[PDB]
Design an enzyme around this catalytic site. Structure first.
Site, PDB file in Angstrom:
ATOM      1  N   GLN B 172      -8.836  41.582 -17.373  1.00  0.00           N
ATOM      2  CA  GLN B 172      -8.341  40.233 -17.103  1.00  0.00           C
ATOM      3  C   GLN B 172      -9.353  39.386 -16.330  1.00  0.00           C
ATOM      4  O   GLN B 172      -9.622  38.243 -16.703  1.00  0.00           O
ATOM      5  CB  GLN B 172      -7.014  40.309 -16.343  1.00  0.00           C
ATOM      6  CG  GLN B 172      -6.199  39.028 -16.373  1.00  0.00           C
ATOM      7  CD  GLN B 172      -4.982  39.079 -15.468  1.00  0.00           C
ATOM      8  OE1 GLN B 172      -4.682  40.106 -14.854  1.00  0.00           O
ATOM      9  NE2 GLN B 172      -4.271  37.962 -15.382  1.00  0.00           N
ATOM     10  N   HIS B 176     -11.642  36.329 -18.234  1.00  0.00           N
ATOM     11  CA  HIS B 176     -11.315  34.956 -17.845  1.00  0.00           C
ATOM     12  C   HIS B 176     -12.517  34.120 -17.395  1.00  0.00           C
ATOM     13  O   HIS B 176     -12.345  33.027 -16.848  1.00  0.00           O
ATOM     14  CB  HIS B 176     -10.219  34.945 -16.775  1.00  0.00           C
ATOM     15  CG  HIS B 176      -8.830  34.959 -17.336  1.00  0.00           C
ATOM     16  ND1 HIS B 176      -8.261  36.087 -17.886  1.00  0.00           N
ATOM     17  CD2 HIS B 176      -7.896  33.984 -17.428  1.00  0.00           C
ATOM     18  CE1 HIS B 176      -7.036  35.806 -18.295  1.00  0.00           C
ATOM     19  NE2 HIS B 176      -6.790  34.535 -18.029  1.00  0.00           N
ATOM     20  N   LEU B 353      -6.837  37.555 -29.773  1.00  0.00           N
ATOM     21  CA  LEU B 353      -7.025  39.001 -29.836  1.00  0.00           C
ATOM     22  C   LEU B 353      -6.967  39.677 -28.465  1.00  0.00           C
ATOM     23  O   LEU B 353      -6.420  40.772 -28.335  1.00  0.00           O
ATOM     24  CB  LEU B 353      -8.365  39.304 -30.522  1.00  0.00           C
ATOM     25  CG  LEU B 353      -8.783  40.736 -30.862  1.00  0.00           C
ATOM     26  CD1 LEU B 353      -9.560  40.745 -32.164  1.00  0.00           C
ATOM     27  CD2 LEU B 353      -9.598  41.371 -29.736  1.00  0.00           C
ATOM     28  N   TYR B 354      -7.526  39.022 -27.451  1.00  0.00           N
ATOM     29  CA  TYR B 354      -7.702  39.646 -26.141  1.00  0.00           C
ATOM     30  C   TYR B 354      -6.450  39.600 -25.261  1.00  0.00           C
ATOM     31  O   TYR B 354      -6.464  40.108 -24.138  1.00  0.00           O
ATOM     32  CB  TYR B 354      -8.893  39.021 -25.406  1.00  0.00           C
ATOM     33  CG  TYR B 354      -9.874  40.038 -24.860  1.00  0.00           C
ATOM     34  CD1 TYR B 354      -9.611  40.735 -23.681  1.00  0.00           C
ATOM     35  CD2 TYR B 354     -11.067  40.304 -25.528  1.00  0.00           C
ATOM     36  CE1 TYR B 354     -10.516  41.672 -23.182  1.00  0.00           C
ATOM     37  CE2 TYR B 354     -11.977  41.238 -25.038  1.00  0.00           C
ATOM     38  CZ  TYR B 354     -11.695  41.917 -23.867  1.00  0.00           C
ATOM     39  OH  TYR B 354     -12.592  42.839 -23.382  1.00  0.00           O
ATOM     40  N   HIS B 357      -1.390  41.864 -22.819  1.00  0.00           N
ATOM     41  CA  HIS B 357      -0.363  41.840 -21.784  1.00  0.00           C
ATOM     42  C   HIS B 357       0.472  43.128 -21.695  1.00  0.00           C
ATOM     43  O   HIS B 357       1.031  43.414 -20.632  1.00  0.00           O
ATOM     44  CB  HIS B 357       0.528  40.606 -21.946  1.00  0.00           C
ATOM     45  CG  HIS B 357      -0.205  39.311 -21.777  1.00  0.00           C
ATOM     46  ND1 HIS B 357      -0.048  38.506 -20.670  1.00  0.00           N
ATOM     47  CD2 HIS B 357      -1.111  38.689 -22.569  1.00  0.00           C
ATOM     48  CE1 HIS B 357      -0.818  37.442 -20.790  1.00  0.00           C
ATOM     49  NE2 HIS B 357      -1.474  37.528 -21.933  1.00  0.00           N
ATOM     50  N   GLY B 495     -12.369  43.159 -32.738  1.00  0.00           N
ATOM     51  CA  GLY B 495     -12.737  42.925 -31.340  1.00  0.00           C
ATOM     52  C   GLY B 495     -14.175  43.267 -31.003  1.00  0.00           C
ATOM     53  O   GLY B 495     -14.868  42.478 -30.362  1.00  0.00           O
ATOM     54  N   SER B 499     -17.039  41.297 -29.106  1.00  0.00           N
ATOM     55  CA  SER B 499     -17.366  41.853 -27.795  1.00  0.00           C
ATOM     56  C   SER B 499     -18.861  42.138 -27.643  1.00  0.00           C
ATOM     57  O   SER B 499     -19.488  41.678 -26.684  1.00  0.00           O
ATOM     58  CB  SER B 499     -16.545  43.122 -27.532  1.00  0.00           C
ATOM     59  OG  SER B 499     -16.413  43.374 -26.144  1.00  0.00           O
TER      60      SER B 499
HETATM   61  C1  HEM Z   1       0.743  40.317 -14.564  1.00  0.00           C
HETATM   62  C2  HEM Z   1      -0.483  39.828 -14.777  1.00  0.00           C
HETATM   63  C3  HEM Z   1      -0.712  38.667 -15.774  1.00  0.00           C
HETATM   64  C4  HEM Z   1      -0.168  37.444 -15.695  1.00  0.00           C
HETATM   65  C5  HEM Z   1       0.802  36.936 -14.602  1.00  0.00           C
HETATM   66  C6  HEM Z   1      -0.647  36.665 -16.821  1.00  0.00           C
HETATM   67  C7  HEM Z   1      -0.314  35.356 -17.104  1.00  0.00           C
HETATM   68  C8  HEM Z   1      -0.950  34.519 -17.997  1.00  0.00           C
HETATM   69  C9  HEM Z   1      -0.543  33.174 -18.365  1.00  0.00           C
HETATM   70  C10 HEM Z   1       0.700  32.432 -17.814  1.00  0.00           C
HETATM   71  C11 HEM Z   1      -1.429  32.701 -19.256  1.00  0.00           C
HETATM   72  C12 HEM Z   1      -1.400  31.308 -19.932  1.00  0.00           C
HETATM   73  C13 HEM Z   1      -0.859  31.454 -21.354  1.00  0.00           C
HETATM   74  C14 HEM Z   1      -0.326  30.141 -21.872  1.00  0.00           C
HETATM   75  O1  HEM Z   1      -1.143  29.277 -22.285  1.00  0.00           O
HETATM   76  O2  HEM Z   1       0.920  29.960 -21.880  1.00  0.00           O
HETATM   77  C15 HEM Z   1      -2.428  33.735 -19.483  1.00  0.00           C
HETATM   78  C16 HEM Z   1      -3.520  33.655 -20.323  1.00  0.00           C
HETATM   79  C17 HEM Z   1      -4.328  34.689 -20.755  1.00  0.00           C
HETATM   80  N1  HEM Z   1      -4.219  36.030 -20.385  1.00  0.00           N
HETATM   81 FE1  HEM Z   1      -2.865  36.758 -18.936  1.00  0.00          FE
HETATM   82  N2  HEM Z   1      -1.496  37.468 -17.563  1.00  0.00           N
HETATM   83  C18 HEM Z   1      -1.561  38.709 -16.957  1.00  0.00           C
HETATM   84  C19 HEM Z   1      -2.305  39.780 -17.412  1.00  0.00           C
HETATM   85  C20 HEM Z   1      -3.295  39.750 -18.379  1.00  0.00           C
HETATM   86  C21 HEM Z   1      -4.126  40.862 -18.814  1.00  0.00           C
HETATM   87  C22 HEM Z   1      -4.064  42.313 -18.281  1.00  0.00           C
HETATM   88  C23 HEM Z   1      -4.961  40.417 -19.760  1.00  0.00           C
HETATM   89  C24 HEM Z   1      -6.019  41.263 -20.511  1.00  0.00           C
HETATM   90  C25 HEM Z   1      -7.295  40.872 -20.579  1.00  0.00           C
HETATM   91  C26 HEM Z   1      -4.694  39.006 -19.965  1.00  0.00           C
HETATM   92  C27 HEM Z   1      -5.341  38.179 -20.859  1.00  0.00           C
HETATM   93  C28 HEM Z   1      -5.186  36.817 -21.008  1.00  0.00           C
HETATM   94  C29 HEM Z   1      -6.009  35.966 -21.845  1.00  0.00           C
HETATM   95  C30 HEM Z   1      -7.207  36.391 -22.722  1.00  0.00           C
HETATM   96  C31 HEM Z   1      -5.438  34.549 -21.677  1.00  0.00           C
HETATM   97  C32 HEM Z   1      -5.948  33.252 -22.347  1.00  0.00           C
HETATM   98  C33 HEM Z   1      -6.837  32.497 -21.361  1.00  0.00           C
HETATM   99  C34 HEM Z   1      -7.030  31.071 -21.807  1.00  0.00           C
HETATM  100  O3  HEM Z   1      -7.608  30.853 -22.905  1.00  0.00           O
HETATM  101  O4  HEM Z   1      -6.614  30.146 -21.062  1.00  0.00           O
HETATM  102  N3  HEM Z   1      -3.668  38.639 -19.112  1.00  0.00           N
HETATM  103  N4  HEM Z   1      -2.095  34.827 -18.703  1.00  0.00           N
END
Ligand code: HEM
Ligand SMILES: *[C@@H]1O[C@H](CO)[C@@H](O[C@H]2O[C@H](CO)[C@@H](O[C@@H]3O[C@H](CO[C@H]4O[C@H](CO[C@H]5O[C@H](CO)[C@@H](O)[C@H](O)[C@@H]5O)[C@@H](O)[C@H](O)[C@@H]4O)[C@@H](O)[C@H](O)[C@@H]3O)[C@H](O)[C@H]2NC(C)=O)[C@H](O)[C@H]1NC(C)=O
Ligand SMILES: *[C@@H]1O[C@H](CO)[C@@H](O[C@H]2O[C@H](CO)[C@@H](O[C@@H]3O[C@H](CO[C@@H]4O[C@H](CO)[C@@H](O)[C@H](O)[C@@H]4O)[C@@H](O)[C@H](O)[C@@H]3O)[C@H](O)[C@H]2NC(C)=O)[C@H](O)[C@H]1NC(C)=O
Ligand code: HEM
Ligand SMILES: *[C@@H]1O[C@H](CO)[C@@H](O[C@@H]2O[C@H](CO)[C@@H](O)[C@H](O)[C@H]2NC(C)=O)[C@H](O)[C@H]1NC(C)=O
Ligand SMILES: *[C@@H]1O[C@H](CO)[C@@H](O[C@H]2O[C@H](CO)[C@@H](O)[C@H](O)[C@H]2NC(C)=O)[C@H](O)[C@H]1NC(C)=O
Ligand SMILES: *[C@@H]1O[C@H](CO)[C@@H](O[C@H]2O[C@H](CO)[C@@H](O)[C@H](O)[C@H]2NC(C)=O)[C@H](O)[C@H]1NC(C)=O
Ligand SMILES: *[C@H]1O[C@H](CO)[C@@H](O[C@@H]2O[C@H](CO)[C@@H](O)[C@H](O)[C@H]2NC(C)=O)[C@H](O)[C@H]1NC(C)=O
Ligand SMILES: CCCCCCCCO[C@@H]1O[C@H](CO)[C@@H](O)[C@H](O)[C@H]1O
Ligand SMILES: CCCCCCCCO[C@@H]1O[C@H](CO)[C@@H](O)[C@H](O)[C@H]1O
Ligand SMILES: CCCCCCCCO[C@@H]1O[C@H](CO)[C@@H](O)[C@H](O)[C@H]1O
Ligand SMILES: CCCCCCCCO[C@@H]1O[C@H](CO)[C@@H](O)[C@H](O)[C@H]1O
Ligand SMILES: CCCCCCCCO[C@@H]1O[C@H](CO)[C@@H](O)[C@H](O)[C@H]1O
Lengths: 553, 553
Positions: B172, B176, B353-354, B357, B495, B499
């Site tokens: 994560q 990011h 892809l990434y 969750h 992926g 990657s």
């Molecule tokens: C409990 C922990 C986590 C929370 C609270 C969380 C929450 C969020 C939220 C609210 C979004 C925005 C999505 C939207 O546009 O509605 C997001 C984006 C994203 N998350 Fe998580 N997530 C968590 C864990 C993870 C994990 C483990 C990964 C694995 C890599 C991950 C990967 C991503 C990716 C790739 C995006 C898109 C980023 C972007 O283009 O803005 N997340 N996350």
């Protein structure tokens, strides 16, 4: 304690890194050399250096025989050599880019921040004894006097290669899409973010400006009809920032990609050609693609114009400039078997190098009429009433000046020469002899060897003190010129690398781009491949006049 | 007339161009195929395709027989294969980049505007009968219902590969820095202009913000000390925009490169590690070069941390994820032989892809204490209460969840999965099977073949209708997992290209950059080469806990 890297201790593209209090080491990975300063050759490079003929011998081969080269051009050897020219010239440039004005080292900002100009040699460190490193006097020669004594034109020395004004205005128009030194950020910074043949001098350096220049119908750019001829639109019709004299009517004002093009009729002439080309290309694209939107018709036409430019530059522009009996050929397929980075970052060296001001004659002849600098400059009406076809014929017939040799820049535009020399000191560029070492040449031992002439050489001795103190820009402009050439050897050995790298380093030359789809099919793809300066003008005008980069003889 | 490119007639990497009213032509340049549709193979392609084993067979070889791989890892075969792993995976990606959300074709704007995410496949045209192109129903299945019925976690399914939360948080945190969807500009746009491992999540996405984080003494970033340990500074000292909930004290607020990082203690944990590391590196660099100013000390320290990341990610992160018995090796010198572009642009499909969750557990355990989502999320005191040491130990012992298979994303974060599917439709991504063909795989003939399961496959056909209508994101997570593995084949096969291209495509892996001098000599160059997850932690802590991407066993 004196800074060690002021002596430039390391050879053959080695990197001087300072260690401890007064020490230094050199990293010479893949330079082909070994040692503390890196002068010990490797098995392969020692063989490479003894079997290498001098850059003089190569120039002699390419410019002699008529005969031997008529055979080469009609055979596969033509392609074998072109691939070798592209290969060997481009390797002499860092890609990805290395240094900038702020950083004399590799950094992420130097890679990412495209507002910076690039830099091949590191700056002359601020803690050096002399301003040019180690050798020379405490204060550098006066910028004003050098220009007045060694650069200032007295008698018009024409170009022996038969170069015309039509070339000069192209060499200015084309060059101004990647050279845009910002007044806001100062020296060493650029506005031309495209860093090459992007045509940001036609479409603009930003999107806000681009959307204003566009008609938003059939992918075409805006235009106005004067005397039944197509010209760039008025600012009152397409509100963009244009550098015009305060008081000029908005109707007389003309809007284009580059904001400077309004100051000279020659620049606004080429701006008219490419515009007239873009729109007629859109007509050809809409013929087989009626379903295509405004965006696709526009974006595809741009790429065709990018492709045509590089074709005309490589095959016609550089051809005239080089004076080779070898028929230079634009074919991206040549670099498909070799390692080539399809990116380019415009260097400050190239900026300084491309100040070919001696082209501009004493006056500007238009047919039976002769125009002065006070008449020619800023003239808004001249473009329209004469027309394109009649004005192109005039620039194609008038001989341009000799760049190298010295004492050949007109007094009206002499105020630019001093700015270049002064800005070089602000950039803290390394001496001329160090720039020769980088571009695979031998450093000059004396001022006699630089000029060949006796009188001008003695005066340079007394001013600079040492030859290793001579500046970058004066060096090129005062280097001996071989009788039937436009400039000295250094100009080719330094210019060609930058030039060919920027022309072939364009993404459209990459395998992923170089295909019929990118140009809307076969029709667009052939337009890129069959483009000539003659077809750029006469296919857009009403009558076809004389048009080439050389005078009619 | 129906748009011919809605049928996806062009097989392999062939480009569908529309000609005339109701016609189309297919451009099969350099795809290895010939004909009107790209179906007739060339001599070499016909040979290559018959001698090429199915991706499931090679995965079997890479994940079986320890004896054979013990011989391979101790020999040069490790290098020969790793080079092949790099070359053939990266070749599946267009470079320079091709499409975006605004252009289903190649354009300069697509190459120039860095704000755009890229596309490997063009979007489903707006004028197609069904939303997925030609097949399926007029209205796609409910996004919210799909997430509840097939994606929603019921019972916790841990990862069989023994992946821990330490990996999941790294995933994560790391991910990011190149995934930053702009809420201002909308979907298909990014704020991470660096496109890859630039550490814009440590130093910021812009220069104005970067300087605010920097101490400007010895190249270090700002820091505050709590309980004797080093931590990121407060917003009161480093005023940068971050997404903290309104009401939080500026003291408990902590400033870092990525604005979201203040929301989760896991993300803020890693932010502290890389902070200490950067400042630790600055100390070692100052020792070697006392003459270095702040900028050079900072810039070099950044590059070393960039190198350290690309080492850890390949040799440990991807190693764990792949489960290959072949030891993955980070050596840029492997790509010094073949043709490679050191340029990267993040694709919108890589974003979808990434979204792993399912990695996140039902609750978060820190030793004898257990913290729920309400407690763990948004806590500022948590990372300072336990420290870096205790928190590193905690996440490394708790098992992460299997990404693939299905029914493993917790209900708290389930709302994200819905948005990803909803955004997919806005981006108009091509069906799952079209993305399979592009990545050298066979399209699934039925829903049963996708899942290897009876009940859920039956409902999928009732929801979608045709298998060629299945969407990209649901297709990836609802795919049959190979036993013992973390997800289905498609995530590896799609992926890994993205990657490895983003990792090795970094300019520091280039011949120009990959030098000792770039990292301030041998000391910094070895730091990059000897970088591990254990070293990243132990060296920056007083005591070292259990550190790995896998659960202890
Ligand atoms: C409990 C922990 C986590 C929370 C609270 C969380 C929450 C969020 C939220 C609210 C979004 C925005 C999505 C939207 O546009 O509605 C997001 C984006 C994203 N998350 Fe998580 N997530 C968590 C864990 C993870 C994990 C483990 C990964 C694995 C890599 C991950 C990967 C991503 C990716 C790739 C995006 C898109 C980023 C972007 O283009 O803005 N997340 N996350
Ligand atoms: C490509 O590269 C160029 C050049 O590197 C870059 O151009 C700009 O670079 C800088 C940085 O954006 C611009 O700003 C200059 O920097 C100074 C900073 O000096 C002082 O800053 C602090 C004062 O600001 C703040 O103070 C308090 C707290 O201290 C704070 O609460 C307030 O909010 C306040 O803002 C001070 O603490 C510190 O000690 C320094 O004294 C600015 O003050 C001023 O704006 C300067 O002009 C330049 O203007 C830009 N141009 C040039 C030529 O350098 C580009 O941005 C870059 N491009 C990209 C895309 O990254
Ligand atoms: C990355 O590239 C993006 C391409 O989409 C850019 O998008 C942004 O800028 C555009 C223009 O600056 C915005 O487009 C809109 O254009 C319409 C059309 O009107 C035109 O603008 C003039 C001034 O408003 C008008 O006088 C004239 O009629 C002209 O036709 C306009 O109505 C809108 O107000 C807007 O300008 C676009 O909205 C915007 N964002 C997005 C998400 O597309 C980015 O500029 C570029 N980003 C970066 C960082 O370089
Ligand atoms: C008589 C016509 C000419 C005039 C009036 C002129 C004058 C000037 C002036 C005042 C500038 C500095 C303004 C600026 O861009 O900030 C400049 C820049 C420059 N000129 Fe000329 N010059 C002329 C001819 C030429 C020609 C024919 C060439 C082609 C080789 C040329 C090459 C350049 C270059 C490369 C720059 C730097 C551009 C930049 O970085 O902004 N000049 N000129
Ligand atoms: C701008 O150029 C025009 C050419 O179109 C100049 O007009 C000519 O001026 C000469 C005298 O210098 C006259 O003999 C011609 O008859 C004029 N031609 C036309 C068509 O009017 C004009 O003088 C120039 N502008 C400036 C300010 O010098
Ligand atoms: C390395 O570079 C230095 C500096 O250019 C060369 O010269 C230095 O070392 C010599 C040792 O015998 C001294 O005699 C010089 O005075 C000294 N000069 C300076 C300016 O430092 C040195 O010859 C080079 N080394 C090699 C092996 O070529
Ligand atoms: C190439 O692909 C097209 C589209 O997938 C194929 O479909 C064409 O032929 C069908 C009959 O066999 C028609 O019913 C389709 O309407 C027609 N498609 C179009 C757009 O006209 C086609 O068979 C393939 N080409 C060849 C030569 O076999
Ligand atoms: C965030 O997590 C922290 C963990 O440090 C919580 O603080 C502790 O909460 C536990 C309850 O399990 C208690 O044992 C302690 O009394 C707390 N420690 C301290 C030092 O106060 C904190 O409560 C969590 N935040 C929220 C909002 O739930
Ligand atoms: C032997 C066949 C002649 C082919 C001519 C090749 C032209 C390449 O040009 C070469 O570029 C190099 C880098 O700029 C220089 O080191 C050489 O001096 C120069 O000749
Ligand atoms: O004849 C020569 O032909 C050469 C090109 O073939 C050029 O050097 C000149 O145009 C000319 O001098
Ligand atoms: C015995 C194991 C051989 C290792 C060499 C194969 C590693 C190269 O990676 C290959 O990339 C291809 C294109 O993305 C995929 O189709 C293959 O599944 C994958 O194995
Ligand atoms: C060359 C090595 C000989 C060993 C025979 C090998 C058996 C490979 O059989 C493999 O079984 C896998 C089951 O998980 C499947 O995924 C593959 O499709 C299949 O090829
Ligand atoms: C569609 C993607 C096809 C890529 C396959 C590339 C196979 C590489 O091809 C191999 O390259 C070697 C050099 O490394 C040569 O020694 C071999 O003769 C050649 O078969």
């Amino acid at each position: 304690p004196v800074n060690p890297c002021c002596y430039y201790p390391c050879q053959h593209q080695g990197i001087c890194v300072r260690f401890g209090l007064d020490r230094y080491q050199c990293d010479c990975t893949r330079t082909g050399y070994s040692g503390p300063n890196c002068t010990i050759p490797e098995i392969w490079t020692w063989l490479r250096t003894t079997l290498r003929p001098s850059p003089s011998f190569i120039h002699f081969l390419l410019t002699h025989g008529r005969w031997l080269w008529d055979f080469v051009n009609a055979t596969f050897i033509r392609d074998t050599l072109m691939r070798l020219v592209l290969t060997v010239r481009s390797n002499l440039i860092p890609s990805p880019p290395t240094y900038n004005i702020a950083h004399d080292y590799i950094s992420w900002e130097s890679f990412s921040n495209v507002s910076y100009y690039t830099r091949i040699l590191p700056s002359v460190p601020r803690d050096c004894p002399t301003p040019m490193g180690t050798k020379g006097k405490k204060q550098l020669p006066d910028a004003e006097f050098l220009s007045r004594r060694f650069l200032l034109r007295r008698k018009f020395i024409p170009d022996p290669q038969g170069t015309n004004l039509m070339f000069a205005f192209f060499a200015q128009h084309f060059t101004h899409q990647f050279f845009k030194t910002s007044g806001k950020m100062g020296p060493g910074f650029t506005k031309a973010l495209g860093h090459g043949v992007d045509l940001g001098h036609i479409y603009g350096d930003n999107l806000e400006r681009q959307y204003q220049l566009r008609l938003f119908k059939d992918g075409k750019l805006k235009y106005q009809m004067l005397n039944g001829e197509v010209y760039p639109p008025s600012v009152e019709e397409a509100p963009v920032l244009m550098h015009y004299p305060r008081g000029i009517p908005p109707q007389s004002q003309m809007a284009v990609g580059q904001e400077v093009f309004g100051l000279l009729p020659g620049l606004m002439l080429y701006a008219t050609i490419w515009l007239r080309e873009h729109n007629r290309v859109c007509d050809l694209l809409k013929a087989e693609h009626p379903t295509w939107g405004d965006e696709q018709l526009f974006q595809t036409a741009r790429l065709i114009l990018i492709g045509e430019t590089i074709k005309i530059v490589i095959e016609e522009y550089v051809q005239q400039l080089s004076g080779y009996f070898l028929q230079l050929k634009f074919d991206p397929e040549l670099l498909f078997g070799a390692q080539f980075q399809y990116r380019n970052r415009i260097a400050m060296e190239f900026n300084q190098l491309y100040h070919w001001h001696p082209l501009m004659p004493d006056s500007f002849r238009v047919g039976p009429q002769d125009y002065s600098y006070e008449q020619f400059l800023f003239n808004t009406s001249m473009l329209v009433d004469y027309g394109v076809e009649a004005l192109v014929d005039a620039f194609s017939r008038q001989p341009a000046g000799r760049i190298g040799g010295g004492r050949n820049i007109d007094h009206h535009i002499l105020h630019v020469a001093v700015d270049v020399i002064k800005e070089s000191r602000v950039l803290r560029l390394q001496p001329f002899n160090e720039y020769r070492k980088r571009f695979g040449m031998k450093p000059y031992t004396s001022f006699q060897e630089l000029t060949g002439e006796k009188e001008m050489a003695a005066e340079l001795e007394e001013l600079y003190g040492d030859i290793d103190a001579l500046e970058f820009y004066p060096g090129l402009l005062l280097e001996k010129c071989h009788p039937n050439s436009i400039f000295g050897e250094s100009m080719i050995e330094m210019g060609a690398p930058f030039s060919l790298k920027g022309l072939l380093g364009n993404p459209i030359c990459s395998p992923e781009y170089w295909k019929a789809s990118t140009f809307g099919g076969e029709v667009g793809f052939n337009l890129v491949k069959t483009a000539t300066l003659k077809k750029l003008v006469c296919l857009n005008t009403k009558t076809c006049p004389y048009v080439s980069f050389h005078v009619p003889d």
